[PDB]
């Protein structure tokens, strides 16, 4: 099971590198969008094997709606704030994350 | 006649990009009509100057998704459209390949599936995975698969701003 | 389910370029659905960085044909598709391909209603730009002549399927 | 060990969200650097759990040198292209990724 | 009537000039195809006002099939020979052309 | 006068067919030369019958110098673009082309 997670981590790292190279040609606003895409990918992978928390599933669902859904009419200042704060609150739970 | 035209226009208009794909695979019996519709596209000079690759293996799909940031979720099928430099007449014929890709998108909607063309990818690694020769240059990756979530239209500008009449600035 | 898939597949497949137009003008009732279905094409970021000009005046059509060798017969209607460099992504541009995709939707929009045309693109960009009044940022891409066909559709020879498409590799 | 991998994945996702939110304030050139930073972080997670490949260690060292330590220079078009290409060679190995 | 013909001649001259500029970028084989395209345009204009001969209409019809019709599987060595010889035979008629 | 214009049109069409057939033997660069040669021939027909514009006479002299003058030392891409642009201005004139 650990090996499968590692393989998907390698593919994820390749995606992050490709996004880094791509951002040198993409418009200004994709810096956050690619980070959000990678975040939802990581959360899918982590929900696969890592700690389970209902709010984390809510986070992944919101990211899926943002990305996999219609594009446009999206504000990034506030949306990212709520997403980051919700994830933070989850991580502050002594159970989801380990000291 | 009128009903067939109306149905076709509905099919063309309702075409929406699909970024979420179910884990269902694309059958060959369902892929053949899509390929036929895609290949029935205009070219530069009836030179058929293009190349298509139909990736369906799981490992190849995952590698292409990893090396193509445009792709959002793992697609059951990938169509790699490339310009054929050996048959070429910054190229006019490069537009015809994109026209063929558009026909493939409409074919996906013909069979209820959906495709999301993407041009934001690393040509080098993607070429290496696809095994394309030197002359062929990949230009479009089209993740195609069965839709998993309802499709909604994207915001659109007013028809007056994008379409004029016999001049520019005329409504 | 199978019947509509078959009909749409037949409409898409049996789309042949038309170069011999008849003496039937393209009415506005036959154009509004055409432009409506044509605009429903993928855009780079939904930028919609494109511009279209619908030419029907006989003088303008003759002037466009004269300065554009791509057009073979006088078209009742013309659609000039152009790339909007104002909303270009990253600044060849990928949105130009989206302009071409909308032109493909144009061809099918013409086929369903009984009209026809070809994505002519071999034209003198300068004279055409001056004739159609484009500003600096609108770069002409295609000049599709759309009109009522006068010659029966005749299929053209096509390359072998094995030499054009492959399965997850090249040569396999 | 899988549980610990998951918790670290949650932390990485939180970092991705924070980097995305911050990239609006940070200049454009920081998008690629944040992507590359995330790339080396992911490779760090996969170093002890994922497939062990010598080129993976070399690549992680490359990114470590670039992000960590001295700041400046580090032309990114060539650097990102080279790093991503090397990771591409790594991923094609049958042992690295099974299916 | 005479003025209308002249106006069509100016547009024809503009097409010939545009073809000349175009041929510097078109493939090798359009040198003849553009000449054939211009030839049928001239014959269409000439059939409107100039001398009428049944074989001249046959020429224009064959040219229309070649150009307006399907493209490909066309030979130019022989096809152009028969068309040029048929038009030469017509022109040799003392009635179609004037001394 | 209309009949004579038609006769000269038939001769011009025969010249276009002969030029096309010959262009196979002649090099590629002659494709533009034949089109330009036909352009001035067409304007000659329209000189005495079509609209009389001072710029039309100037243009006809330009192609006359290029063709009837010494061969060589000709930059076709700039020459054709400039000439076609000039003829365009002429055709935009409401008097030159009516509809
Ligand atoms: C033409 C084009 C469309 C793209 C591209 C790139 C090009 C050149 N890249 C995309 C991508 O990376 N991701 C993605 O999700 N879509 C891409 N598209 C499609 C286009 O953005 C959409 O079709 C657009 O949102 C319009 O949607 P629609 O439902 O109205 O067709
Ligand atoms: C894709 C394309 C097609 C063109 C173009 C330019 C582009 C980029 N230009 C053409 C032109 O200038 N004249 C013309 O007559 N056709 C043009 N076409 C269409 C092309 O010729 C057709 O695709 C082909 O002849 C037949 O295709 P088919 O699908 O009908 O068999």
TrEMBL record, chains A, D, E, F:
InterPro entries: DUF6092. The keyword Nucleotide-binding applies. It comes from the Bacteria. FMN binds at residue 71. Keywords: Flavoprotein, FMN, Nucleotide-binding. This is AlbB. It comes from Nocardiopsis dassonvillei (strain ATCC 23218 / DSM 43111 / CIP 107115 / JCM 7437 / KCTC 9190 / NBRC 14626 / NCTC 10488 / NRRL B-5397 / IMRU 509) (Actinomadura dassonvillei). The lineage of its organism: Bacteria, Bacillati, Actinomycetota, Actinomycetes, Streptosporangiales.
Automatic annotation (TrEMBL), chain B:
GO terms for molecular function: oxidoreductase activity. FMN 2 binds at residues 43, 70, 96, 118-120. FMN 1 binds at residues 43-44, 96, 156. Coiled coil: none annotated. The keyword Disulfide bond does not apply. The keyword S-adenosyl-L-methionine does not apply. Keywords: Flavoprotein, FMN, Nucleotide-binding, Oxidoreductase. Residues 155-170 have a biased composition (Basic and acidic residues). InterPro entries: Nitroreductase, Nitroreductase-like. Its cofactor is FMN. Transmembrane segments: none annotated. This is Nitroreductase. The lineage of its organism: Bacteria, Bacillati, Actinomycetota, Actinomycetes, Streptosporangiales.
């Amino acid at each position: 099971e650990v090996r499968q997670v590692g393989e998907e981590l390698l593919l994820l790292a390749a995606y992050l590198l490709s996004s880094g190279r791509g951002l040198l040609d993409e418009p200004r606003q994709y810096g956050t969008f690619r980070c959000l895409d990678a975040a939802r990918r990581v959360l899918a992978l982590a929900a696969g094997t890592g700690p389970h928390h209902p709010e984390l599933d809510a986070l992944r669902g919101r990211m899926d709606d943002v990305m996999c859904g219609p594009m446009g009419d999206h504000e990034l200042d506030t949306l990212l704030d709520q997403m980051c704060e919700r994830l933070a609150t989850v991580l502050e739970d002594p159970d989801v994350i380990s000291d | 006649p009128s009903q067939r035209s109306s149905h076709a226009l509905q099919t063309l208009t309702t075409r929406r990009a699909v970024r979420a794909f179910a884990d269902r695979p694309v059958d060959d019996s369902l892929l053949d009509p899509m390929l036929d519709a895609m290949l029935a596209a205009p070219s530069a000079s009836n030179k058929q100057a293009w190349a298509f690759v139909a990736v369906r293996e799981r490992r190849a799909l995952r590698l292409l998704r990893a090396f193509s940031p445009g792709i959002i979720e793992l697609p059951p099928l990938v169509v790699a459209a490339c310009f054929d430099r050996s048959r070429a007449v910054w190229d006019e014929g490069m537009l015809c390949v994109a026209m063929a890709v558009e026909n493939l998108l409409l074919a996906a909607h013909c069979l209820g599936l959906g495709g999301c063309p993407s041009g934001s990818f690393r040509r080098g690694p993607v070429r290496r995975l696809l095994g394309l020769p030197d002359h062929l240059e990949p230009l479009l990756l089209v993740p195609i698969g069965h839709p998993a979530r309802p499709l909604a239209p994207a915001p659109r500008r007013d028809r007056n701003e994008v379409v004029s009449h016999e001049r520019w600035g005329t409504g």
